[PDB]
Structure 1
Amino acid sequence: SDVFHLGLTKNDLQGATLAIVPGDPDRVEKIAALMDKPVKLASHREFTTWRAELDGKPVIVCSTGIGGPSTSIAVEELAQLGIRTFLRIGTTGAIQPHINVGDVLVTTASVRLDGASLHFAPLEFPAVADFECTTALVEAAKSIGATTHVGVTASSDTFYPGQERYDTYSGRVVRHFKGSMEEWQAMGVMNYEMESATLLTMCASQGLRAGMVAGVIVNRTQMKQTESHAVKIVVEAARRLL
């Protein structure tokens, strides 16, 4: 093993430069099976890595897990293995009334409500997606004819209080995040998720291309085929970036 956590060698990658990074290690199989020749490489902790072939080119699918910390481990160790392009596919909760469940969202940049992004760049540095990756995701979304929204995402280090969920054990939200969802809503923030800020910050500050796409399964103001549309987009976008 060349890496500390993923349990992979540079040879296992077969010269892959692009990697599709879902949050769920159980989704890794689903995405890899859509491409030609799916092969399981290694499964350690929350990192399941599958190698596939797209247009005659080797492509890596590797889970990041929930949150910036394990995302930062996976992305760094994949970069050590030779990956230059990272395309994230996630689930999301929309906070705008006009965004329906089932919609696909392309993130231009993220509100940094995480801690790991700070370990790569100070807060003033924008958690911006790569322009070529964003273009490929937008054009791929139009290719399969999905309802798409492009804009800013709030990337939280937590699922509950940082997304202002009150349906909890304590039933309280710390002062800092009290009324925060309404603030993001008025600022035109589309949605909540938990990985983008870290991924986009660490890639844009280290000379790596990164894209972010998500499927809406819940709208906070108001499931199978939702992932089907999004997975088809991230694979189609990968075709354009190879």
Structure 2
Amino acid sequence: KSDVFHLGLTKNDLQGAQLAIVPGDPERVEKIAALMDKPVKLASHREFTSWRAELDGKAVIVCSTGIGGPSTSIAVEELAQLGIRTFLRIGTTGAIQPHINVGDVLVTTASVRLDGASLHFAPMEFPAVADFACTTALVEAAKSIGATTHVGVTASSDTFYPGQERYDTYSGRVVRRFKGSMEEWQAMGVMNYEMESATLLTMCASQGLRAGMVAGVIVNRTQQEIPNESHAVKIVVEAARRLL
């Protein structure tokens, strides 16, 4: 039985949960839920793996989004239909600033919309902006956990390869739009690349839902293209505590 098309969940499964932690990788869901009380597997369908847990006596959902705006848009919509009102994305990321180190934690205030799904919720003029309370929770959680943290703009790309101006590819080329784009974002102070935040932030900020975004830095793109975690995950859990 399911009250939604993709996730395989009923409202009753959520046990009153109003906050979801949303990693990209289904395999990371169990790990994150294990940091909390009474973790229980709910469902696994396609790229959507969902567990329920408890935090200071209140139910919390952990559900994977898969890679990219499109699958993220499905998980967020269906979770919203089941009663989730606050979404915290926890990701991995490639830093594009020389002064950001592997293992650092980045909190996103807003995202460069290098995606398509965000346009399905708001025109390009609309900012892919995080909720102020969620952002505050993540920043304060980062202090509590103890991590080297940066706060600012992230570039959110519909591709891992040409949209992040990667050249370690089959074609070894990048379309005109993205030729020289990395150095452009770098000059504009953009911190990092990832793949889900523009859709998440736009769809939430334009629909009365709260969203925030934190990621662990797994490569620095000024040094290396292909990578080569816990601070970031402890932070998203600690932030959830503050948003309940």
Spell out, residue by residue over 1:74-124, the C-alpha distance to the aligned partner (whole angstroms, 9 max, x if none): 000000000000000000000000000000000000000000000000000
The structural deviation recorded for 1:227 is 1.3
- Go from structure 1 to structure 2 and tell me whether the alpha carbon gap of 1:192 and 1:223 turns closer, same or farther (over 3 Å shift): closer
> Per-residue deviation at 1:145?
1.2
Alignment of 1:165-184 (within 5 A): 165-184=166-185
Q: Distance in 2 between matches of 1:153 and 1:228?
A: 20
The 2-side partners of 1:120 and 1:61 are apart by 24
CA–CA separation in structure 2 for the residues paired with 1:218 and 1:111: 19
Q: SS at the partner of 2:142?
A: helix
Q: Secondary structure at the match of 1:26?
A: helix
Q: Distance in 2 between matches of 1:168 and 1:227?
A: 26
Q: Distance in 2 between matches of 1:228 and 1:149?
A: 16
Give CA-to-partner distance per residue, 1:192-221, whole Å, 9 cap, x none: 000000000000000000000000010011
Instruction: Report the CA distance between 1:228 and its aligned residue.
Output: 1.0
Aligned-pair distance for 1:223?
15
**SS of equivalent to 1:169:** coil
1:235 aligned residue: 237
Contact 1:106–1:134 (Cα < 8 Å) also in 2:
yes
Q: Distance in 1 between matches of 2:41 and 2:222?
A: 40
With normalisation by structure 1, the TM-score equals 0.98
1:5-44 to 2 correspondences below 5 Å: 5-44=6-45
Mapped partners of 1:184, 1:230: distance in 2: 23
Paired with 2:145 and 2:53, the residues of 1 have a C-alpha distance of 22
CA deviations over 1:143-188 (Å, ceiling 9, x no partner)? 1110000000000000000000011000010000000000000000
Q: TM-score normalised to the size of structure 2?
A: 0.97
Matches of residues 184-203 of structure 1 in structure 2 within 5 Å?
Answer: 184-203=185-204
Q: Give the whole-Å Cα distance in 2 for the aligned partners of 1:118 and 1:221.
A: 30
Residues in 2 aligned to 1:109 and 1:183: alpha-carbon distance in whole angstroms:
17
Q: Secondary structure at the match of 1:69?
A: helix
Q: Distance in 2 between matches of 1:223 and 1:34?
A: 32
CA distance in 2, matches of 1:64, 1:223: 27
For residues 228 and 163 of structure 1, the distance between their equivalents in structure 2, rounded to whole angstroms, comes to 24
- 1:93/1:191 contact within 8 Å kept: yes
8 A Cα contact 1:217 1:223, kept in partner: no
Match of 2:127 in 1: 126
Identity of aligned residues (%): 96
Cα offset, 1:135, TM superposition = 0.1
Structure 2 gaps of 5+ residues are none
Per-residue CA shift, 1:14-44, capped at 9, x if unaligned? 0100000000000000000000011000000
Q: Secondary structure at the match of 2:135?
A: helix
Conservation of the 8 A alpha-carbon contact between 1:102 and 1:223: no
Pairwise CA RMSD of aligned residues? 1.7
Shift of 1:233: 0.1
Q: How many residues align?
A: 241
3-state secondary structure, aligned to 1:98: coil
Tell me how far apart the structure 1 counterparts of residues 39 and 17 of structure 2 sit (CA, whole Å).
14
Give the deviation of 1:5 after TM superposition. 0.2
Structure 1 residues 223 and 62: alpha-carbon distance in aligned structure 2, compared to 1, 3 A threshold:
farther
